[PDB]
Amino acid sequence: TGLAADIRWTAYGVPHIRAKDERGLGYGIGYAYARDNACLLAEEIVTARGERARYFGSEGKSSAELDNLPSDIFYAWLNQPEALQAFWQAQTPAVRQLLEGYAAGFNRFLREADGKTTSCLGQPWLRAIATDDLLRLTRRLLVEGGVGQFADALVAAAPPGAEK
Amino acid sequence: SNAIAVGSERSADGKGMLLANPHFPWNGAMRFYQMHLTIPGRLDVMGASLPGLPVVNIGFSRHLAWTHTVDTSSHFTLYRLALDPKDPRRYLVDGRSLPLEEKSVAIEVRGADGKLSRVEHKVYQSIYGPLVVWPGKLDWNRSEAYALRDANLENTRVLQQWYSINQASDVADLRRRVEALQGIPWVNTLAADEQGNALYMNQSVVPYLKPELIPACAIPQLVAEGLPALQGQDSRCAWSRDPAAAQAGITPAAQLPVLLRRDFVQNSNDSAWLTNPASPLQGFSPLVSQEKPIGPRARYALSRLQGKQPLEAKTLEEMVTANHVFSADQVLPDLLRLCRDNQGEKSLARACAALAQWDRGANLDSGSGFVYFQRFMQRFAELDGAWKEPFDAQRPLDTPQGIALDRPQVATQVRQALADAAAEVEKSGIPDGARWGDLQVSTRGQERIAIPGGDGHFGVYNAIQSVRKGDHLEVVGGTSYIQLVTFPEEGPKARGLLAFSQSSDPRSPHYRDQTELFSRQQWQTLPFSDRQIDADPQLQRLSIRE
Numbered sequence A: 001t002g003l004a005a006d007i008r009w010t011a012y013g014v015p016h017i018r019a020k021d022e023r024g025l026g027y028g029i030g031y032a033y034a035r036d037n038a039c040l041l042a043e044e045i046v047t048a049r050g051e052r053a054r055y056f057g058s059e060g061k062s063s064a065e066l067d068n069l070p071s072d073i074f075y076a077w078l079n080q081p082e083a084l085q086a087f088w089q090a091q092t093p094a095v096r097q098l099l100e101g102y103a104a105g106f107n108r109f110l111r112e113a114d115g116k117t118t119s120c121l122g123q124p125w126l127r128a129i130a131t132d133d134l135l136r137l138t139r140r141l142l143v144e145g146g147v148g149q150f151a152d153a154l155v156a157a158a159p160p161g162a163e164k
Numbered sequence B: 001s002n003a004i005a006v007g008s009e010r011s012a013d014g015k016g017m018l019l020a021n022p023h024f025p026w027n028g029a030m031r032f033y034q035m036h037l038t039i040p041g042r043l044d045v046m047g048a049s050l051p052g053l054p055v056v057n058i059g060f061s062r063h064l065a066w067t068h069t070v071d072t073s074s075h076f077t078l079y080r081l082a083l084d085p086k087d088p089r090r091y092l093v094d095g096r097s098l099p100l101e102e103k104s105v106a107i108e109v110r111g112a113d114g115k116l117s118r119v120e121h122k123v124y125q126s127i128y129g130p131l132v133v134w135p136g137k138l139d140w141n142r143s144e145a146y147a148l149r150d151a152n153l154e155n156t157r158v159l160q161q162w163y164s165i166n167q168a169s170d171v172a173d174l175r176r177r178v179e180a181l182q183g184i185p186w187v188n189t190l191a192a193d194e195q196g197n198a199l200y201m202n203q204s205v206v207p208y209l210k211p212e213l214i215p216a217c218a219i220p221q222l223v224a225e226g227l228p229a230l231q232g233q234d235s236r237c238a239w240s241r242d243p244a245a246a247q248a249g250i251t252p253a254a255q256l257p258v259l260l261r262r263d264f265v266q267n268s269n270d271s272a273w274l275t276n277p278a279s280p281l282q283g284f285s286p287l288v289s290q291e292k293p294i295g296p297r298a299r300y301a302l303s304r305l306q307g308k309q310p311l312e313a314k315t316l317e318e319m320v321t322a323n324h325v326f327s328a329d330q331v332l333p334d335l336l337r338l339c340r341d342n343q344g345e346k347s348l349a350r351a352c353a354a355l356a357q358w359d360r361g362a363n364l365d366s367g368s369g370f371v372y373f374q375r376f377m378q379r380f381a382e383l384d385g386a387w388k389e390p391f392d393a394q395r396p397l398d399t400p401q402g403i404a405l406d407r408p409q410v411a412t413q414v415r416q417a418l419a420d421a422a423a424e425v426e427k428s429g430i431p432d433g434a435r436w437g438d439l440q441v442s443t444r445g446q447e448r449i450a451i452p453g454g455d456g457h458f459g460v461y462n463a464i465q466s467v468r469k470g471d472h473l474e475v476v477g478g479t480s481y482i483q484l485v486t487f488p489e490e491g492p493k494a495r496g497l498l499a500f501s502q503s504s505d506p507r508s509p510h511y512r513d514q515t516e517l518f519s520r521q522q523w524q525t526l527p528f529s530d531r532q533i534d535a536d537p538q539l540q541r542l543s544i545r546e
């Protein structure tokens, strides 16, 4: 609460968000983004939470084309509660507020969604999001130029047995 | 990705100008999204962003436009461990045996029966970070293993960094804000302002090693292969600490390439080296920037940018919309000579006719010559010493060039390559008189939309990556958010499109509306001012609170 935004859309569904503060600004963004892309974000959050196998089984892949289980292992490792906590604690008040508004705005659209622009309505994985979920997505993007390109390699790393 | 910033000395209006042409996935966690953000009085910025981020990643404001391209700098180092001879779960630092740490994660797995099973997996970690295995290259045996230290794992500044960029006024202010925070993970930054400054920054998070440490700390055979690999059995090979760096172990901003000019700067995913050939960037850490031959996209851009003629907005737009396959400029003249030299060759007839009739483009109406050329180039790439003029460091913009047809061995192998390419193309099921746009599409529901452009590796500035799916090539990545910004008196003028449209959901009115426009290459106004926004006959408004 203390969340308010003015949204204007121009041609092609481009939102112009006006607010008095970062919380309000994030509120507008999350709402507008959800209108166009609720299902995409929900799916990528599942990925970044390491929950693909839970909802979809081991036979599928993420949108990055990694197998569900290896992907889950990587993201469970990457997005451990202590890593998320330390990351959050290093955030400025303004960024915390952007994130808090975004989650609230996204979740507002979810409460109201009737399927007009949302194809995954009723799916168990389409759920309210938290700021931690946005941290999960951020850290996923952060490692794209580093350990992210070695996700399969990390999962494959095991010590030798008794071999010659 | 491509980026071009033009300054007062080269722009037609004497002001700044920026072309932003990022190449990114058409789906998933890196699908660009347009938005305009305003906190009246202190924030007013428009562009596009990645999913989940409440900041603008590439955009513009009243006096500034900026963009990014993936850099060639390293953002991690591998460490080769020397294993304890008595225990492959221990590793040596300065001859001392250290234990690996074992961290278990537990994952729930939905089975065939629909019920959940718990799977436990052990992640081994060293002081450097987690162990990684590439079977056949980076093994974990009884002698060695490899750990990976990612510099961006400690970069907690990334979101603040873009929020700060969003607040930047001009090029000098942008440079201060980026250099101060060093929050950018793995991209170059290019920008132009109203004053006509053109800025390039290779300013990101990069592992720091003092110059004198590299020779001894590198793994020679791996660095030779472009992997940032260090000796993990020597504590002196830990990333260097410098108090000026915003993060311990990363490179200080003063040691990273920056070029501030009033003519132009460009980047198409090569190193900082030839951002502007008039002022080469050199003498940086191998982990930062090296003098490697540029790719055909940068070579194409420089061939249009070099010189004394003023650059118009139209010029920069057409560099994208021309869909010129610049790799043809180096190869096709001699290939056609080869064709004319082999007119008796039945197996060459269709290929040679198609190549001779080809407009050297990746336009919708471009002939099947493009497809023949693509398959030839994939085989040409694997031939040894086939260039008439191989890469020349003294002539880095004009080499390599031509086919060494005067060498019989080369002539034989090039003709064979064309024969094999021809067979592969004809073995396909591409109907008679099919154009490139008949093949490369983006599926939308049950429908398809023809997509112009082609692979960046063939020097098409409008880079489009596609994969074979049934009877077509399905677009997966490439040209995405397009932004061309100028600064006339009334306020910034932004022109572009989001190629794949705002929404990934088939139910949305904005699922394919801009994709129809991208197909026809009809860029549109990106409205930024209240006057521009109010003038839009489609304008809709909602105020929300809780």
Ligand SMILES: *C(=O)CCCCCCCCCCC
Residues within 6 Å of the ligand: A138, A141, A142, B001, B002, B022, B023, B024, B050, B057, B068, B069, B070, B158, B185, B187, B269
């Ligand atoms: C061309 O190389 C594409 C460049 C993509 C720019 C994305 C901006 C980086 C944002 C990272 C967020 C953590």
